[PDB]
Amino acid sequence: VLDLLDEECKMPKGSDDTWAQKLYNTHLNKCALFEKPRLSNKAFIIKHFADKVEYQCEGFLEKNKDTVYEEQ
Amino acid sequence: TTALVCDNGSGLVKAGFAGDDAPRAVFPSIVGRPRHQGVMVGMGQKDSYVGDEAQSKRGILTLKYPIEHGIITNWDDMEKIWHHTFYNELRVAPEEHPTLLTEAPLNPKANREKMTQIMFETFNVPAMYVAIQAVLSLYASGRTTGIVLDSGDGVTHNVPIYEGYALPHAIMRLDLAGRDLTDYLMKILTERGYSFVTTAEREIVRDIKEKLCYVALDFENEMATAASSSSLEKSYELPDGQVITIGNERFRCPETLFQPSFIGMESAGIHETTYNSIMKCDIDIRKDLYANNVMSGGTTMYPGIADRMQKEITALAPSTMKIKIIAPPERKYSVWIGGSILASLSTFQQMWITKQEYDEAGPSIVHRKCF
Amino acid sequence: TTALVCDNGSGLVKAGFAGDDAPRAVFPSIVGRPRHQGVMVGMGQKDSYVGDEAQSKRGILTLKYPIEHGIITNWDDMEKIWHHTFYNELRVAPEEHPTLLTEAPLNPKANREKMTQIMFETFNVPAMYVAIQAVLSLYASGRTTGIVLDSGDGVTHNVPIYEGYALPHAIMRLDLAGRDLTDYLMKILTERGYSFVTTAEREIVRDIKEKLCYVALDFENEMATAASSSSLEKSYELPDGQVITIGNERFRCPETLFQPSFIGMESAGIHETTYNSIMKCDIDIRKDLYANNVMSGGTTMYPGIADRMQKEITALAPSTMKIKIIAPPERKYSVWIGGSILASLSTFQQMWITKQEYDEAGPSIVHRKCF
Amino acid sequence: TTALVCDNGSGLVKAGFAGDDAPRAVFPSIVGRPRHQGVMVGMGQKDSYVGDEAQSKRGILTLKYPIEHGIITNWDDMEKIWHHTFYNELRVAPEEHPTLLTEAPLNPKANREKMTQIMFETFNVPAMYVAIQAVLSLYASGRTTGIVLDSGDGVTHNVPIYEGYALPHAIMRLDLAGRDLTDYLMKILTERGYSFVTTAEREIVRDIKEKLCYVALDFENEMATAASSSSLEKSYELPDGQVITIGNERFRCPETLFQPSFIGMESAGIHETTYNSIMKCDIDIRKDLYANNVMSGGTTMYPGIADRMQKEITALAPSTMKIKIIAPPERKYSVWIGGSILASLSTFQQMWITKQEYDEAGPSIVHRKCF
Ligand SMILES: C/C1=C\[C@H](C)C[C@H](C)OC(=O)C[C@H](c2ccc(O)cc2)NC(=O)[C@@H](Cc2c(Br)[nH]c3ccccc23)N(C)C(=O)[C@H](C)NC(=O)[C@@H](C)C1
Ligand SMILES: C/C1=C\[C@H](C)C[C@H](C)OC(=O)C[C@H](c2ccc(O)cc2)NC(=O)[C@@H](Cc2c(Br)[nH]c3ccccc23)N(C)C(=O)[C@H](C)NC(=O)[C@@H](C)C1
Ligand SMILES: C/C1=C\[C@H](C)C[C@H](C)OC(=O)C[C@H](c2ccc(O)cc2)NC(=O)[C@@H](Cc2c(Br)[nH]c3ccccc23)N(C)C(=O)[C@H](C)NC(=O)[C@@H](C)C1
Ligand SMILES: Nc1ncnc2c1ncn2[C@@H]1O[C@H](COP(=O)(O)OP(=O)(O)O)[C@@H](O)[C@H]1O
Ligand SMILES: Nc1ncnc2c1ncn2[C@@H]1O[C@H](COP(=O)(O)OP(=O)(O)O)[C@@H](O)[C@H]1O
Ligand SMILES: Nc1ncnc2c1ncn2[C@@H]1O[C@H](COP(=O)(O)OP(=O)(O)O)[C@@H](O)[C@H]1O
Ligand SMILES: [Mg+2]
Ligand SMILES: [Mg+2]
Ligand SMILES: [Mg+2]
Numbered sequence A: 001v002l003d004l005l006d007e008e009c010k011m012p013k014g015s016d017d018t019w020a021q022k023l024y025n026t027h028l029n030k031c032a033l034f035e036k037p038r039l040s041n042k043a044f045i046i047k048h049f050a051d052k053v054e055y056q057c058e059g060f061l062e063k064n065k066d067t068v069y070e071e072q
Numbered sequence B, C, D: 001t002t003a004l005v006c007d008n009g010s011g012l013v014k015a016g017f018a019g020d021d022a023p024r025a026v027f028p029s030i031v032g033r034p035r036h037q038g039v040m041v042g043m044g045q046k047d048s049y050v051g052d053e054a055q056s057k058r059g060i061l062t063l064k065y066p067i068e069h070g071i072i073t074n075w076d077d078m079e080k081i082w083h084h085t086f087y088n089e090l091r092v093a094p095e096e097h098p099t100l101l102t103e104a105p106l107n108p109k110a111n112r113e114k115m116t117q118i119m120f121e122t123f124n125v126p127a128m129y130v131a132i133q134a135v136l137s138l139y140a141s142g143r144t145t146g147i148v149l150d151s152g153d154g155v156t157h158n159v160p161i162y163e164g165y166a167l168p169h170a171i172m173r174l175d176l177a178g179r180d181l182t183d184y185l186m187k188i189l190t191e192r193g194y195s196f197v198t199t200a201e202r203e204i205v206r207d208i209k210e211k212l213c214y215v216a217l218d219f220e221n222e223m224a225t226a227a228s229s230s231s232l233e234k235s236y237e238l239p240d241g242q243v244i245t246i247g248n249e250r251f252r253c254p255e256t257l258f259q260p261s262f263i264g265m266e267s268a269g270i271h272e273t274t275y276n277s278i279m280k281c282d283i284d285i286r287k288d289l290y291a292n293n294v295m296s297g298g299t300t301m302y303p304g305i306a307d308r309m310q311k312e313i314t315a316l317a318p319s320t321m322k323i324k325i326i327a328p329p330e331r332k333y334s335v336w337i338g339g340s341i342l343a344s345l346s347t348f349q350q351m352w353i354t355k356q357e358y359d360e361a362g363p364s365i366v367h368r369k370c371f
Helices: A002-010 A016-027 A060-065 B052-057 B075-090 B109-122 B133-141 B179-193 B198-212 B218-227 B247-257 B272-280 B286-291 B305-316 B334-344 B355-361 B365-369 C054-058 C077-090 C109-122 C133-141 C179-191 C200-212 C219-228 C248-255 C270-279 C288-291 C303-315 C333-342 C355-361 C366-369 D053-058 D075-090 D109-122 D133-141 D178-192 D199-212 D219-228 D249-255 D270-278 D285-291 D305-316 D334-343 D356-363 D365-369
Strands: A043-047 A052-057 B004-007 B011-018 B027-028 B031-034 B061-064 B099-103 B127-131 B145-151 B158-160 B173-175 B234-237 B243-244 B293-298 C004-007 C013-018 C025-028 C031-034 C059-065 C099-102 C129-132 C145-151 C156-164 C172-174 C234-237 C244-245 C291-297 D004-007 D013-017 D025-027 D031-032 D063-064 D099-103 D127-132 D144-151 D156-162 D172-174 D234-239 D243-246 D293-296
Touching: A002 A016, A002 A060, A002 C054, A016 A060, A016 B109, A016 B334, A043 D127, A060 D063, B004 B075, B004 B334, B011 B075, B011 B334, B011 C366, B011 D127, B027 B052, B027 B075, B031 B052, B031 B075, B052 C234, B061 B198, B075 B109, B075 B293, B099 B109, B099 B133, B099 B334, B099 C133, B109 B127, B109 B355, B109 B365, B127 B334, B133 B145, B133 B293, B133 B334, B145 B272, B145 B286, B158 B272, B158 B286, B173 B272, B179 B243, B198 B234, B218 B247, B234 C133, B234 C366, B272 B305, B272 C031, B272 C145, B355 B365, C004 C077, C004 C333, C013 C077, C013 C333, C025 C054, C031 C054, C031 C077, C059 C200, C077 C109, C077 D013, C099 C109, C099 C133, C099 C333, C109 C129, C109 C355, C109 C366, C129 C133, C133 C145, C133 C291, C133 C333, C145 C288, C145 D334, C156 C270, C156 C288, C172 D365, C179 C200, C179 C244, C179 C248, C200 C234, C219 C248, C270 C288, C270 C303, C291 D063, C303 C355, C303 D293, C355 C366, D004 D075, D004 D219, D004 D334, D013 D075, D013 D334, D025 D075, D031 D053, D031 D075, D063 D199, D099 D109, D099 D133, D099 D334, D109 D356, D109 D365, D127 D334, D133 D144, D133 D156, D133 D293, D144 D270, D144 D285, D156 D270, D178 D243, D178 D249, D219 D249, D270 D285, D270 D305, D293 D305, D356 D365
Parallel strands: B004 B099, B099 B127, B145 B293, C004 C099, C099 C129, C145 C291, D004 D099, D099 D127, D144 D293
Antiparallel strands: A043 A052, B004 B011, B011 B027, B031 B061, B145 B158, B158 B173, B234 B243, C004 C013, C013 C025, C031 C059, C145 C156, C156 C172, C234 C244, D004 D013, D013 D025, D031 D063, D144 D156, D156 D172, D234 D243
């Protein structure tokens, strides 16, 4: 998940929707611990140690980006 | 729990909750696949698109309509379109809500068998029913008597009804359509030098047919008028910004409904099949059928089709007998509005097929209960 | 391990590590041999020179470009240039790093076969891929839709792409070039009395073309202006300190891209091949192609080529349709920057050709995997 | 007086007198202009060349085809080609003889209007008619029933006919062509390292396509065979005496007719459009259409296209229903032979458009009388 989020940061016209679509392509039925909420396409579920947790995609790419321009 | 009401067709899908005033999800019913080699890496390339997505991307795609002539002709794409309708576009789980489904009359039985089998097995819908389009048009227009004429993409059909009883022997069906009007529009448009070959071009032709066609009140007089003068001739802007000018043809296109001989069929036009359907009814009711003609579905939206119909029936019908055509402006949606009204009724709640009754009888039950 | 990213061409070689912001090694791609009898003893005479060395010595040397028109036309000199690239100029052993290589589209297949065979057998690179220049320009400019126009020394080519799918039938290739602009510059320069015959003189002509040429916005108006006035006329200093003065010719030289009839070809200029490539695309995408035109490679560096292109396409294109030309200042390197971005992506790591797959399938695998 | 019979197309012009067994004048339909500066004085420099002259000189010339896709797209060059046809190459004044002209179906009306206007006004032909190519193929092959498939340079079209009545709704048209097969042949030939850029090179590619291409009976089996073995690989001698070797590609080129997806279109191949055209016919005739398939025009000359068509239709058509393909060796000329037969008939003499009827009705008469 983190490595696809980092790829989506740099890839042009990146978005949270195309990230989520990459999640579903990569994991949706290959890993028992990753799950998609049935009624939505903007979220994913990780079975943690304690509990399942829905994570919303809407924040992720806006928050993940850092690049600090050296001249500044 | 509010039942879902879903109306499939060739062309648009219309879906929403019962008791709503208007459908919540409307989108053209298309499944599209890419036909070019995806060159960029990591794009997130997707197997196929549905509805509005397939419309936006369409330049990349082959567009295939999974229903031709009201028959579902590949069940995988249709099941994709329902999956998109419930989960993506209404965002409501089918395991909560009864569902109501809509079909053209005199269709094959297997279409209902498969449609119920997919609803119970593949979506686990707790209850379902299948209504006739024409019956629902009467609920929408607020009547219990009349001869319905309903024409969409795909099927055109007349169903006479008198105080809530159908007259099965008088039901008529015809395969003139928005679609065959579109293919005729392409084949005639070729005359002026414009060639629309691919499916995504056909969608442009469809938009030309919606925006610019109109039903000539008198055919040969407007033919002579268009030969004499530019005044009838009007122009449209293709997506790339080129302009095309179309002439007499724009009235020539929707008349084929009245004269199927243009597209090459022999069965008479919607006026004469309306008259012949009334004539197949017993003589006492016929006054009330002439008093009510209810139009439905998009192919009856053309400007002037109401007056051309009223005139040409009045020419067919006995001179004393008052002919009236009832064309409500909303009529593109009236089959859905009627389905909403029906599904809301309390008396109807008796009449759903329930999952237990399906498990007992198997998918043939639909013929027994529904119609 | 960071993959290498290497972009060969006629003219400069550009190489560096993936994920860098700009290429670490840039040098003109030349192999040079001495043509004079070495008189001194113990000089340290060397069999042949590569790159910047051949540039410095060049007065002594025959300079040969091992790639003309994007095709490798003697494999020994090309293998020398790769040897210099990996060992001398990047100083990194190829047995550690995947490598990414770049080619113009619609090249012969044998060029990819030989290039992969030499990478696996002669450098033992653990994995390699071959990308299209135009595709990489889209990664660099930050887009997934547009028609790329990319022109270096050797090949000029347009590749339209729409949401990550190429349109192979619409790909155009042309052999106007920095090089044929150079040979035209020599043949026209003769008019004013200056004759640059040898290859090391051609390098001077190339430096004149870089420093002083500019694309006339309107050709005949600037021809009349240069006939009327000195004001357009500008001068340059040969290595020996002589001065030369060049006139109207300095704008006459880069226009041949727009009018190949000057050099003697008949195929229309880069504007009309851009338009013809868009026209070979289906009508729905064309708005987005006109919205994005991406220039790439050094031959698009001339002052005013962006505005001359925008004007002349707008004259070709339907009047309503907004035409935009996207000429980023970096565009000389954008094929490398795009290769760096692509090689950095995590999804791509699936997509390298690996040495095992080569040993199993032989060098023909490149056609299967790469494009 | 013997009427002239003239059959225009993209590619060859075929003209001769009615009642002759074979056309008297056949020459490729090209207008050519010089593109080099004439240096010699008193050469007799000529504004432009037509037909065989433009072929012989062609290395000096830009060659322009005045008909693309069966549409006349610049009327001056077309009028030159008619001038050359009547005066230079038949040497007979048009003011003596009725003329018969030939067109692909479903063309724009303006093409017939202008062609008649130029015949009456500019050549003063006493009478003229315009026939459909497919109809004439049936006269040539000696039948009054069948589905014609006729493919030349430019248009490919199917026209079903049953006992002398056409079935307009079942007419199909496609823009696969000898010409698009040629452009595909150039674009694929590039793979092996051979680049044919200019129009006079395109004429070489056309001659390669004529001499060496053949339709693979089973595509993937011959692809594997050509990958495995040289035995399929054959070589040709360019005009300058260089040799080129072409491999699997020579069968790869004509299959695109069967799989337009190679050139990038989506509409199915000539077999599936033939089947779909039969299916658009009413169910009683279909046996007789399957019994007769008539091929016409040069693009159906490829070795094995007859057997590949018969096999692939038999695979599409119901197994009992006898499929027959009728490919006469003369079929390149059969549209002319049919025009000769028709023009010779006595009943036809009623049916010419006469000059008086043109003066009365204007050039629109052609739509009324001809079809
Ligand atoms: C050769 C013939 C029939 C067929 C090709 C023979 C095959 C064997 O019948 C099938 O079983 C296939 C299929 C079919 C599809 C789904 C299904 O659950 C059951 C059957 N039904 C069809 O293709 C229908 C569809 C249809 C049109 Br549109 N409107 C209609 C109105 C009411 C009912 C159905 C339809 N169709 C196009 C035809 O019949 C055509 C007009 N029929 C003929 O030309 C005659 C000469 C007989
Ligand atoms: C943008 C569009 C149209 C045009 C560019 C819009 C312009 C405005 O139309 C014209 O009026 C010009 C002209 C034309 C030429 C001569 C003439 O006496 C009348 C018109 N006709 C043409 O360029 C034809 C020629 C043609 C091909 Br090949 N087969 C065909 C089959 C039947 C008829 C004609 C043809 N042509 C190439 C096209 O339509 C292309 C395929 N059309 C399209 O992509 C769609 C999306 C609409
Ligand atoms: C006489 C002809 C061909 C040749 C001389 C005949 C010989 C026999 O072909 C070869 O096999 C040699 C070779 C070649 C080189 C390396 C290789 O792994 C395979 C072949 N290819 C070449 O010399 C190419 C290179 C090239 C230019 Br630049 N852009 C191109 C675009 C696409 C592809 C290739 C190219 N080249 C210069 C030509 O074709 C010239 C333009 N062709 C012609 O004038 C016509 C009339 C046909
Ligand atoms: N304003 C309009 N004028 C003419 N035709 C229309 C108009 N709107 C829609 N259509 C055509 O009517 C058909 C759609 O009819 P509709 O009844 O909405 O389909 P459905 O049967 O799926 O409900 C299509 O062919 C569409 O192009
Ligand atoms: N500032 C400039 N103005 C015009 N032409 C230039 C300029 N800089 C380089 N060129 C020319 O562009 C060509 C190099 O293009 P480039 O894309 O860098 O080569 P490559 O294809 O190897 O990357 C050479 O002909 C060079 O002379
Ligand atoms: N024996 C052949 N095999 C394959 N293609 C051929 C053959 N002879 C001619 N052609 C091609 O067919 C086209 C000419 O078709 P034709 O029908 O004769 O032209 P027109 O439409 O002018 O009558 C040209 O592309 C020509 O190169
Ligand atoms: Mg409807
Ligand atoms: Mg480059
Ligand atoms: Mg022909």
